[PDB]
Structure formats: C-alpha cells, structure tokens
Design a binder for this molecule. Structure first.
Ligand SMILES: *[C@@H]1O[C@H](CO)[C@@H](O[C@@H]2O[C@H](CO)[C@@H](O[C@@H]3O[C@H](CO[C@H]4O[C@H](CO)[C@@H](O)[C@H](O)[C@@H]4O)[C@@H](O)[C@H](O[C@H]4O[C@H](CO)[C@@H](O)[C@H](O)[C@@H]4O)[C@@H]3O)[C@H](O)[C@H]2NC(C)=O)[C@H](O)[C@H]1NC(C)=O
Ligand SMILES: *[C@@H]1O[C@H](CO)[C@@H](O[C@@H]2O[C@H](CO)[C@@H](O[C@@H]3O[C@H](CO[C@H]4O[C@H](CO)[C@@H](O)[C@H](O)[C@@H]4O)[C@@H](O)[C@H](O[C@H]4O[C@H](CO)[C@@H](O)[C@H](O)[C@@H]4O)[C@@H]3O)[C@H](O)[C@H]2NC(C)=O)[C@H](O)[C@H]1NC(C)=O
Ligand SMILES: [Ca+2]
Ligand SMILES: [Zn+2]
Ligand SMILES: [Zn+2]
Lengths: 239, 630
C-alpha cells in the first residue's frame, strides 16, 4: 500500500507532470513487482522490481461467508426502457444476424448460507452482478469458504488485504508460489483466512471505510470479464 | 554398484572460526589466534592421493560424507598422513574384521589387524558391504545417517577431528528429483576437547557445529517454500547432552513433530524442516551453560528460481505474590537438606520467597482473579488451542520490572490488530511490557504447529517471559500450553529447579527474610544452595499431592523447564504410562522440552512422583499422587 498526503492508496494515480511523495513500509521479505496496471499491455513497460532485504541494526469479529463461483444467464437490461433510439442503445442490446445483444451467460460470485451450497443467502437488487458485500474492520478475520461450480477453474482473492493464507495451514498446496494464482477445480472447496490488519485500514485523514474488491485471479483479464468481481470494504472500529 | 572413496588423515591448524583455514586441506599437483592442531578426513580423487577435492565451507572438519545404497560395496582407502595412527570404523554397515577398524582380542590374523590402526605414512583399503538388512525398514527415511570414525584411541580420534558422515540409502540413491531445492545438510553437533586430542597429550572445550563455534559456519542456505533435510550426528567423548532448537521452526524426526531435537554422543537423526519464512534463523543449543553454547550457527532461507475454529480469549497478568515451596505443611528437622533449603535460617531465606507469576483473570478489568486448582502449582493458566484456533492473550503487567508473554511452539504470533512490531523492536519476544500496561497478543495455531497423526493428540508446550529468559523464569513466570488436533481433569506437571539466586527479587527476599540483611554473604555456596528449590510444579518435598480417582484414565502433560542443565529421567512410582505408542516407565526429558504420556490409573496405592536422578530427589523434587476409589 502507498501512504500519500495522508491516505492509504492502493495504486498511484499518475499522468504527465504528477508529483508525489509516497512512502511505503516493508513487512515481507522478498521481491515484489512495481508496475502499471492498465489493461492495455502496452502499458507494460512500467514494470520494475523491488527487493526487500534484511539489513543490519469491541473484540474483532470473525465473519464467515460461503461463496460460490457459479454460472448464470446475465441480463444487462432487464427493465423496459427501450424507446429512446436515435442514440446507440439498439446496438448493444439487440438480437439478430451477429448480435448476442444483451443476455450473455456469465459466471458470478454468489453467497450461500452453509457448507452445503444448496441454498443461497440474501441477494439484493441494485448491486446486480457483483458478488456479496464483504465487510471487515481492522482486526477482524474473514473465513471465505469458497466452492466453485462453473465451467473453467476459478478462484477468489482480495486485493486490499496483505494477510491471506489458507485456513489452518500456512503453506500452499503444490508448487504454488502464491495463493493468488492457484486455481480451484471441479467443485472442490478451498477455505481461506483473510485477516484485516492495521496497515490495510484507513488513516484518520480518510474515511471510516475504504473501498476494495475481490476477483478470481487464475486469469484476471478474462475472469473479471466473465464477471468474477465483488466489493470488499475495510473499515475502522469504535442502511 | 561399487563405490570408491579415497580418504586421508590430514593434520591441519584450526581456530574454530575462519573457514579460510580450510584451504590448507587442498593438495598439490606439485591471527586472530586461538589456532589448534587438529586432524581430519579429507577426500582425494586418485589413489596417488595428490588431488584433494575442496572442503565445502559448511562441512568444517566433517569428513567427506560417504554414501552408498543397498547392495553397494564400498571401497575406501585410508592414507595416514597425520602425526599419529588412525583407523576407519563404519557404523551402520557390514564388514569382515579386516575392513572393520577397531582392535581387540578378536582372535584374528595379523593382517586382519592392519585395519585396526594404520600407521603414519601408510595406507589401507577397506571394504564395506551394504547388505539387504542394512537399509531403511520402509518406515525410516530414504537414507540412514551413520558415521565413520578413526578408532584406535576413541577419545583422541574423536576429539582430534576424525569423524565424517555416512548415509546408507534405499535403492534409488541416483533417482534425482529436486535439484538443490530440497537441500540436505550434515549437522555434526560435537564437543571437541582440544585438551584430550593427540595434540599436547588447562585447555578448552569447544562446542561446535561442524567444527565452527560462535555463529560461524557459512553456507546453510535453503530454498524458501520447500523442505530441508538434516542428517544429524552428535559427538563427544564425555556424556553431555544438547537441546538443539531452530528459531521459528519445528523439526520432523521419525514421523513425530519434534520441537526440541534432543541429542547426545552418536545420536543419529534424520530430521526434516519445512521452510516457510524468508530470513535468518538461529540454530543453537539451549542448555543454560553457554558452555553448551558456542553451538550456534546461522541458517538463511532464500527464494530460488525453479470443525471451524474457536478463538480463546485470556486475561493473564504478571503479578507478584508471596510464594512458599513447602506450603507451611512441611515439618522440618535440624540436620540439613529440608532445613537448609526450607526452614528460615540465620543465613537462609528458608522456604518463603517473593515471586512473580502469570495469573488468570475473568475480564479486562483485572479486578477479580479466576479459578485455581492447586495441583498445577506455581503455573500460570493452562492455554489450549486445536489446529486452526486463535488465542487472544490480553496480558497486563502488574509487577515491578518489564515482563512478557511469549509462546514456545506457536509460530504465528503478532500483536492483535497489526502485523507491525512497535517502536524500535525487531521481534515481539524481545519487546518488554512496562509495569501497568496491557498488550494484546494474537497466537495463531497453524498445522505445522501441532500433532502429526503419529504423535499425541496434544503436544505439550510452555509459555513464559522473554525480556530475560533465564531470570524471568527463575522469578516464577511459566505456564502450560497445549496444541491439540480436532475432556479431562487435565494433569500438568513441571519439574522446575527455581534458582532463587537469579530471581529479580532475591534482593527483596534477602532483606525481608534474613535476620542479618545487613550482613549477608551472597556467595556462601550453600546459602545459594539454600535457594535452588528443586520443585515439581510449585512445591519441593512432597508438598505436592495429586488425588486421582481409581480408574480415572488420565493424560499427563509434563515438562522440564527451569534452571536445569541435565536431562531429567522421570517416573511414576507405581505405573507405566503410554508414550509414543508404546508403554515405558521412565520418561526422559531434556531441558525446555515437554512430552505427553497417556496413563490409566489402576493399581491403587499412594505412590511418589519423582525424577530418578537421585541428587535431585534428595533436594526436594518429589510429588505424591495418591490414587483410591470414589
Ligand atoms: C518489453 O516487453 C515485451 C517483452 O516481454 C516486448 O514486446 C513485444 O516485442 C516484440 C518483439 O520481441 C514485438 O513484435 C514485433 O514488433 C515489430 C515492431 O512494430 C511495433 O511498433 C508499432 C509502433 O506503433 C506498434 O504499433 C506495433 O503493434 C508493433 O508493436 C513488428 O514489426 C512485428 O510485426 C510482426 O508482424 C508483421 C505483420 O505481418 C510482420 O510483417 C513482421 O515481420 C513481424 O513478424 C512484431 O509485432 C511486439 O510488438 C512487442 N509488443 C509491444 C506491445 O510493443 C518489448 O519489445 C520489450 N522490449 C522493449 C519494449 O524494449
Ligand atoms: C565465541 O564467543 C564466546 C563468548 O563470547 C567466547 O567464549 C569466551 O571465551 C574466552 C576465553 O576463551 C573468555 O573471554 C576472554 O577471556 C580471556 C581471558 O579468559 C581466559 O584467559 C586466559 C588466557 O591465557 C586463560 O588462562 C584464563 O584461564 C581464562 O580462561 C581474555 O583474553 C579476553 O580478554 C579480556 O581480558 C582483560 C579484561 O580484564 C582484558 O585484557 C580485555 O579487556 C578483555 O576484557 C576475554 O575475557 C570467556 O570465557 C568467554 N566469553 C564470554 C562472554 O563468556 C569464545 O572464545 C568465542 N570463540 C572464539 C573467539 O573462537
Ligand atoms: Ca580387525
Ligand atoms: Zn502505463
Ligand atoms: Zn550444548
């Protein structure tokens, strides 16, 4: 995370003659990619390594979610508001010669109530497509019981929390460098322990909560494009 | 198949610290001080013995480490270039008495006593057979750790440096799998008595890893999220034991999770260690001599190319308390022992001493203590956690000095809300808590923290104060911690010599209990003897007394933690108990190591819980344990 002016920022938003003094703090030994993240891989020279090295001299909740990647038919426009059309609307949402139009089959994140994944927790209109709201104050833990249910191996990983190991074990399953790019299979379940620490949270000078997100990372680009995305708040302690 | 090795006893000058005095152990074609004369095993490549092969820096004085797999014959050729005679005795493999290398009345031919003792200038072939029954037994690792050593004068040959590793392996030594991802290393925990070697036969005891002292020894590197396999050899010519810890890490010997690694001369272990933490860790011997220190050596890990948990909340406080080890029940005498140690004497504090200890409380108020149960005596509260559980330790310091609470055997501890240590502090176990303050600790039990299907359902571990390991423990800060898998009266025993001469409070007790606080001699060696309380849980001499129902089928978490330097061999006068899947009747415990023995009470007297090591027994270290029905 970057600390600038006095705010926890995840990226640096920069552009011609932008000037910052950002500071960051290094808790994990190792090598980490500094890099520009714009979808256009041309934006992809802005990539440098940073090596970090030893040198010389009330009570926090645990939240539990059962979440499934699983496929559905997604409607981009389920509300009869068509008429207005000397303006584009037709192109993106009509069926025929070579338009799918508006009903694309996608895969989402979907919250269920227990390890059985046979019954869904409360959906809510307005947040459509995006997976379940994942809250977590500084200090808390989130148990993300994850079950897949799709037609490609997916995954679920939060950008925002540093401490995301498997539950129970601290060591990863195979030749797995990182839980982020390790996939979940047939309808296997994985159990993750996200722990929200202080250095993830706001900074007096920024808001009670700050806005993050999770997504499958086996292939960030096309997974998110298939619709694996959902919101994650990270907040502070004491409709 | 067949395996040719060329060795050669080479005399060298060695200072125990600079890996550069190894280069002299190379070969032709053609300050600051200390420096001793030694002699070691060097490889060569020809039979001409003019081509050395270089000593790897991390092996030190270790010999070249011969390997053969099952069915392989091993041909080895000594050449005695040292001042003195040598030999080549193999442990772990078959010989014929001429490829043996020890002399005795074996009623053998004078050429079958050439192996026995080769002479300077000379040389000798040896032939070792790896028979079908020389090998792994399946339940052992793929290679077995053994050793060659010179064997003409064992005291001198060992103390001079004539030892090296030897690994009998299954079939598929050559199989290859993880090119230096999975690192094997040889660790030779050895006490070279430079005064009892062929050199100068007032000198010193070197306590070395591979012949290096003080954190020397280059080269112990390991690939990050992978395992490293240690091949372990203990060595010395006197008894001596060593507790061998690796910071941040537990071992895996047999199919047990060893945390201690307990060694004595010619212990042969294969321990595995999974590495999941970048950085440096200290491999060292924990015996409180620092004479048993010097066995320290860094270990770098680096990164190479290619039913739902519970959270236990605890309010523990370091708070001071009058404490007596003979709780005004021990009737004295006037002769000695239990009168010198107990019994308020003129130059004797006697039996009541000011201690500090961990204590439970019910809420963050710290304004009502908790239950007790007097069996678990001086002990702080009992701390439990199955694999996957978190322990929330809200710890208040209600004493004078700064203190601490750190787990031994939990790896993932940090403050409760942040992973960032405070102030200028590099690790929590160094970070002291000033009088009056609370700190909130989060102890996270992972899988590599606990039982391995092959050892108990509960690993016995302790916690305590680390702003001054030794003296904080002396002062009374110690508590049991169980680390289980997925129900009993509980049963925890702790053998603890409490060296009151180290107690931070000795100065207070000196004033508050001698009638001559003015004139006290702090070095009368029986006065200080009067303050080593050889204590079981809290109490010396049979002041401790366990009452178990006849038939109550128990579970005893025992630990040896205190001023001790010798291993405690420990017994229950009437019973046997179930240890590591078999029954025994003595349970050996090195310092700072706990074990879980499962016991069924069935024959029904009143017995004696005690050590075995007589001169501890006679200075108190004894409980009672009466069983009867109910
Ligand atoms: C840093 O990052 C990566 C390495 O990971 C590299 O990126 C690609 O590098 C390859 C070469 O190794 C590039 O491939 C070739 O590029 C040639 C140059 O044209 C480029 O420039 C114009 C400028 O506007 C771009 O618009 C255009 O898209 C190209 O990117 C092309 O001539 C080559 O064309 C091929 O196809 C044509 C069509 O038939 C043939 O006629 C050619 O003979 C040839 O076969 C080819 O595409 C590739 O373009 C690079 N990618 C990007 C996004 O630039 C970087 O090179 C590396 N090092 C740097 C940046 O210094
Ligand atoms: C690894 O690290 C450990 C721990 O630091 C060292 O263990 C130390 O061992 C040495 C002795 O080997 C001790 O420290 C030094 O002791 C010397 C005096 O002790 C011996 O000296 C004579 C030498 O002829 C012996 O006859 C005598 O019987 C003692 O046994 C000194 O040379 C050192 O210098 C000090 O002396 C005076 C102070 O008045 C001054 O000249 C100096 O200022 C200096 O202070 C020093 O005292 C001690 O036993 C151990 N140290 C500790 C802290 O316990 C290992 O030696 C080391 N390994 C190495 C170096 O290879
Ligand atoms: Ca012989
Ligand atoms: Zn860019
Ligand atoms: Zn030792």
């Amino acid at each position: 995370t970057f600390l600038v002016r006095h705010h926890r920022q995840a990226s640096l938003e920069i552009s011609p003659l932008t000037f910052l003094t950002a500071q960051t703090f290094l808790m994990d030994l190792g090598q980490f990619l500094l890099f520009c993240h714009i979808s256009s891989h041309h934006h992809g020279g802005m990539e440098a390594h940073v090596r970090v090295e030893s040198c010389a001299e009330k009570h926090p909740k645990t939240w539990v979610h059962y979440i499934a990647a699983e496929e559905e038919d997604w409607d981009y426009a389920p509300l009869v508001l068509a008429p207005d059309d000397r303006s584009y609307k037709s192109q993106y949402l009509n069926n025929g010669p070579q338009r799918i139009g508006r009903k694309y089959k996608k895969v989402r994140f979907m919250a269920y109530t227990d390890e059985t994944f046979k019954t869904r927790e409360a959906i809510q209109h307005e947040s459509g497509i995006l997976g379940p709201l994942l809250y977590g104050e500084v200090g808390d833990t989130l148990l993300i019981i994850f079950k897949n249910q799709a037609s490609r191996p997916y995954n679920i990983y939060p950008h925002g929390i540093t401490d995301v190991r498997p539950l129970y074990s601290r060591r990863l399953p195979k030749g797995v460098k990182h839980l982020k790019d390790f996939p979940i299979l047939p309808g296997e379940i994985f159990k993750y322990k996200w722990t929200v620490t202080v250095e993830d949270g706001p900074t007096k000078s920024d808001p009670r909560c700050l806005t993050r997100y999770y997504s499958s990372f086996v292939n960030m680009e096309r997974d998110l494009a298939s619709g694996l995305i959902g919101p994650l708040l990270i907040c502070y302690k004491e409709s | 198949a067949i395996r040719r090795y060329y060795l050669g006893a080479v005399e060298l000058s060695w200072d125990y610290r600079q890996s550069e005095l190894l280069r002299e152990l190379h070969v032709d074609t053609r300050g600051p001080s200390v420096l001793y004369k030694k002699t070691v095993f060097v490889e060569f490549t020809d039979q001409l013995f003019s081509v050395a092969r270089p000593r790897p820096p991390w092996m030190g004085l270790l010999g070249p480490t011969i390997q053969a797999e099952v069915y392989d014959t091993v041909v080895v050729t000594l050449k005695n270039m040292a001042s003195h005679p040598v030999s080549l005795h193999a442990v772990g493999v078959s010989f014929w008495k001429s490829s043996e290398g020890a002399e005795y009345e074996d009623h053998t031919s004078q050429r079958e006593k050439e192996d026995d003792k080769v002479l300077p200038g000379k040389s000798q072939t040896y032939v070792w057979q790896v028979l079908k029954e020389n090998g792994p037994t399946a339940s052992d690792p793929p290679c077995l750790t053994y050793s060659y050593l010179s064997h003409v004068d064992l005291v001198k040959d060992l103390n001079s440096g004539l030892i090296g590793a030897l690994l009998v392996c299954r079939e598929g030594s050559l199989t290859r799998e993880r090119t230096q991802n999975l690192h094997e290393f040889v660790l030779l925990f050895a006490v070279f008595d430079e005064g009892k070697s062929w050199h100068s036969a007032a000198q010193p005891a070197m306590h070395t890893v591979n012949g290096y002292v003080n954190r020397s020894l280059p080269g112990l590197i390991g690939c990050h999220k992978k395992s490293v396999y240690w091949h372990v050899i203990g060595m010395g010519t006197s008894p001596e034991v060593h507790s061998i810890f690796l910071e941040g890490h537990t071992f895996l010997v047999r199919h047990h999770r060893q945390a201690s690694l307990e060694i004595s001369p010619l212990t042969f272990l294969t321990a595995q260690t999974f590495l999941m933490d970048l950085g440096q860790f200290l491999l060292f011997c924990h015996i409180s001599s620092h004479h048993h220190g010097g066995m320290e050596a860094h270990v770098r890990v680096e990164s190479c190319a290619e039913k739902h948990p519970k959270t236990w909340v605890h309010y523990i406080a370091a708070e001071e308390e009058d404490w007596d080890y003979a709780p005004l029940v021990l009737a004295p005498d006037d002769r000695s022992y239990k009168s010198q140690y107990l019994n308020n004497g003129p130059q004797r504090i006697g039996r009541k001493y000011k201690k500090v200890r961990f204590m439970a409380y019910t809420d963050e108020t710290f304004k009502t203590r908790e239950a007790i149960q007097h069996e678990s005596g001086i002990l702080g509260p009992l701390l439990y956690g199955e694999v996957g559980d978190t322990l929330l330790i809200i710890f208040k310091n209600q004493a004078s000095r700064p203190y601490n609470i750190y787990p031994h055997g939990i790896t993932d501890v940090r403050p409760l809300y942040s992973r960032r240590l405070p102030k200028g502090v590099k690790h929590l176990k160094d970070f002291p808590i000033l009088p009056g303050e609370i700190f909130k600790y989060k102890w996270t039990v992972t899988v590599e923290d606990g039982p391995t299907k092959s050892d108990p359902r509960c690993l016995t571990r302790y916690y305590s104060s680390f702003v001054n390991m030794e003296r904080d423990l002396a002062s009374g800060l110690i508590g049991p911690l169980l680390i289980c898998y997925k129900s009993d009266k509980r049963n925890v025993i702790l053998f603890s010599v409490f060296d009151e001469n180290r107690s931070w409070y000795l100065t207070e007790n000196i004033q508050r209990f001698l009638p001559n606080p003015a004139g006290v001699q702090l070095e009368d060696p029986e006065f200080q003897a009067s303050n080593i309380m050889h204590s079981i849980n809290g109490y010396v001499f049979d002041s401790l007394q366990l009452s178990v129902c006849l038939h109550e089928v128990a579970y005893w978490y025992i630990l040896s933690i205190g001023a001790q330097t010798d291993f405690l061999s420990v017994f229950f006068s009437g019973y046997t108990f179930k240890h590591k899947m078999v029954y025994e009747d003595t349970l050996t415990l090195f310092p700072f190591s706990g074990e879980t023995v499962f016991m069924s009470m069935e024959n029904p007297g009143l017995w004696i819980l005690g050590c075995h090591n007589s001169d501890f027994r006679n200075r108190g270290m004894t409980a009672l344990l009466k069983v009867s029905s109910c």
